[PDB]
């Protein structure tokens, strides 16, 4: 299997409160402090948080925030951007040029797929050739980028609260979503499981 | 060239108040009845509410505009996270002398990708997979939906100097619609 | 008892599209031309879009409602941050049997002190500080149809405070009148 | 009349990047590698980005603050819709702290107001306490509680959002108890973000 989606942790929330060391301990803390005269406080870390998700007490999961660096394609980025709750950071359209050569994209026919690879590579090299030819002649990076295909490799910072991350990963890992995006979301999920064990457990998410 | 068409706007049902703008003025008056600012003109009130950052009255009205642009300018557009967008389905929908050189070489490249794009479709390749070869300049049409507060700030940002020319043109075509539906706010902002 | 009144809704300007629900239905069909699901009822198509989390169509429409509630219920209401709200200026605008009895006795005394403070020329923003959570409040609640679906679904479900249930139910009725096909796709 | 206390702030993992502010300055530099502006100080780069509306690098950092205020002010604060909030349960929490008297604006008239506030406030407390004793639900018992009732809230938001909240709420005209609260936030903000404070001229 091809890996057409990568993610890396950039930052995550860190509590300054005594005894509470991680963002997930803060989500746990937020829940028990706000609702002290509740029997549900006595439950396990995962169990408490599961109850909150089940009951829609979302705000505790918004006391935490995580930035992940995503490596994907412009055509996929197009979908990612539509997740309005998140905040993003991308390369300057004027002070940054495309380094990586666009890779061939798989289709949804053994000699039909091979053709699609060869033909893409052909067109990509042609766009890349003309991209640098335009740069050499003085054309601004913002004008030159218009010839770059949708397969253009891209790195973006995707920043959002934990609640938002829960729903983005739930959606983008569900049956039917584009593969170059399920790869991305699963790459995100791996980082999430790590940082949030008790949430991963309450949502039933395995490595 | 980049263009915009009005698709929908807020229309109040409170008797006497007909347009979305009238409602914004109404909302600023009814919430502040003992305020001397209610005496002034429609534009006077709103210019005042804008200066003092009373944004909520501008949040009682919403507007959808259809933008005809390119994927590269839309790369910017989609970044104004306060707006709601509606684009076509990825799966169910199909598409001096150096300056002369840049155009000829663009058309040549663009004809090739479009050919291969069509070649891929006839072969049975899914549209979402076929899109991947299309340049950042593939023409796009999107619905941009947001509150009047949001539009004021998008237009103010995207029409300022430094903005990519092709986005300025888009923003200016949004400004013309905004000036038509909200003339008292255009007068208030000096547009 | 909490009530709601429709202030304003989205109205399309495009030919063949007259109501805000038609614009949603329009957007949901124009999205998928090659799609076969495009040949379902107005409500069937929308039921599919809700199911498949194709929310953006429900964000082409926007609605305002005037809520007649209390400050104690507004403390829940104001927490639905996807909504925009408009309230009377804090500066330029002025306001079982044992429980009901002792409550009136306190509330009436609260007004004597409130009215005296304004008679004395105290600023309204200051005179609000003596006011109880029970104090009535008329607010404007504006949000996209997506945000309205989720607020009503949450605030009508068992467990929420009755006073908030009444408020949300009063919002549900307006929604049902403006969006029958969405109300039907949601089984309301 | 209102205090703030830091609860949590974003913590980067990138090498050479140790703080939320350092990450903001980093996000701006990695983003535009072929730009001269990057060779200014952390404060300079950030002043440039603020002035030119490059807001997204300010949306890579997040802060949570516990605010100690009145229900009357909380009501204003809750309107800052880009922020996320965490409050005590309306059901499983009880108001211990007796509401204090608020200062009126337009000594003997001021005294009248404080005395009358203390009277009405205590009266509401005894009735609150008795309704609880009499088995009335904590959510139904809070309706007799006044707008002066002390409240502790978690206010969580991106650094961009905090810049504008501090600026608006410390600006001329703002209600006094709100300025004080906005100032107690300004104090924490400056400590965590000195080069942003420097670019905005906050000290
Ligand atoms: C000169 C420039 C350089 C940029 N460089 C980069 C880059 O290198 N990399 C990158 O990834 N991105 C870059 N961006 C994009 C940028 O940081 C934003 O992400 C983009 O401009 C979207 O803005 P926004 O979040 O303000 O969205 P909007 O949706 O327009 O604003 C969000 C909210 O903020 C409010 N708001 C905005 N201004 C005001 C105001 N004055 N008063 C009150 N409310 C206001 C709006 O009304 C709205 O509710 C750049 C933008 C510009 C203009
Ligand atoms: C199958 C599918 C088909 C699509 N087809 C089209 C098309 O043809 N054209 C088009 O323009 N777009 C399409 N889209 C994009 C879609 O309309 C959304 O706009 C995009 O998915 C962003 O989702 P969102 O706005 O919920 O984003 P997010 O930012 O992920 O979510 C917004 C907010 O909602 C909250 N939230 C989301 N889900 C939940 C939940 N279950 N419970 C509690 N809170 C929640 C989040 O926490 C967040 O604050 C499609 C999407 C899907 C999944
Ligand atoms: C039982 C209960 C107990 C609570 N206890 C506390 C407490 O002790 N302390 C406290 O501070 N707060 C509490 N809250 C409040 C809660 O944490 C939220 O702050 C509040 O209800 C507002 O929710 P929201 O952010 O989902 O707002 P909204 O404005 O309704 O949501 C923001 C966005 O999420 C999207 N969304 C939501 N649900 C869905 C969905 N199902 N599918 C797709 N999109 C969706 C919306 O459409 C909207 O765009 C409680 C809430 C409940 C229901
Ligand atoms: C003088 C005054 C009078 C008011 N009167 C009333 C009244 O009579 N009735 C009533 O109901 N409400 C009133 N309000 C409240 C008001 O209209 C807003 O609802 C409240 O101030 C919250 O602001 P916000 O939506 O900007 O929220 P925020 O969460 O602070 O802002 C939302 C977004 O806008 C962005 N933003 C804001 N300013 C800028 C900027 N300069 N540049 C870039 N981004 C920016 C933020 O960064 C954030 O992402 C008043 C407020 C003031 C200050
Ligand atoms: C003169 O042409 C220009 C001028 C400035 C920019 C600045 C800029 C934006 O405004 C923007 O939204 C953006 C969105 C996503 C990545 C980068 C940028 C980005 O770098 C892009 C083209
Ligand atoms: C087979 O792979 C697929 C499957 C579903 C889709 C559906 C879809 C999304 O999910 C999406 O976010 C999106 C975002 C913006 C425009 C269109 C779409 C869009 O059409 C796209 C490719
Ligand atoms: C039985 O009536 C109830 C039922 C549930 C609640 C739960 C709850 C909300 O729903 C809510 O928005 C809220 C908003 C701000 C603080 C606390 C709460 C909060 O605690 C409060 C009273
Ligand atoms: C000096 O006292 C003041 C001065 C001005 C205001 C203005 C103001 C806000 O700023 C605010 O969020 C607000 C929220 C809800 C209703 C009214 C207001 C409102 O009127 C409030 C108190």
Author numbering:
A (entry chain C): -3 to 104, 119 to 217
B (entry chain A): 0 to 94, 120 to 215
C (entry chain B): 0 to 94, 123 to 215
D (entry chain D): 0 to 105, 120 to 216
Paper text:
The last step of dTMP synthesis is the methylation of 2′-deoxyuridine-5′-monophosphate (dUMP) to dTMP. This N5,N10-methylene-5,6,7,8-tetrahydrofolate (CH2H4folate)-dependent reaction is catalysed by two distinct families of thymidylate synthases, ThyA (EC 2.1.1.45) and ThyX (EC 2.1.1.148; flavin-dependent thymidylate synthase (FDTS)), without detectable sequence or structural similarity. It forms a tetramer with a 222 symmetry.
In order to obtain further insight into the mechanism of ThyX inhibition, we solved the crystal structure of C8-C1 bound to PBCV-1 ThyX at a resolution of 2.6 Å. The space group was P1 with four ThyX homotetramers per asymmetric unit. C8-C1 binds within the catalytic pocket between two ThyX monomers (hereafter called monomer A and B). The binding of the 1,4-NQ moiety is further stabilized by four hydrogen bonds: the carbonyl group at position 4 interacts with the hydroxyl group from Ser-88 and the main chain N from Gln-89 in monomer B. On the opposite side of the ring, the Arg-182 side chain from monomer A forms hydrogen bonds with the 1,4-NQ carbonyl and hydroxyl groups at positions 1 and 2, respectively. The aliphatic parts of the Gln-75, Glu-152 and Arg-90 side chains form the wall of a hydrophobic pocket that accommodates the 4-methoxybenzyl group of C8-C1. This pocket is distinct from the one accommodating the dUMP phosphoribose moiety; hence, the binding mode of the inhibitor is distinct from dUMP binding. When the IC50 at a fixed enzyme concentration was plotted as a function of the dUMP concentration (indicated as [S]/km), a linear correlation with a positive slope (r2 ≈ 0.97) was observed, indicating that the molecule C8-C1 acts as a tight-binding competitive inhibitor with respect to dUMP.
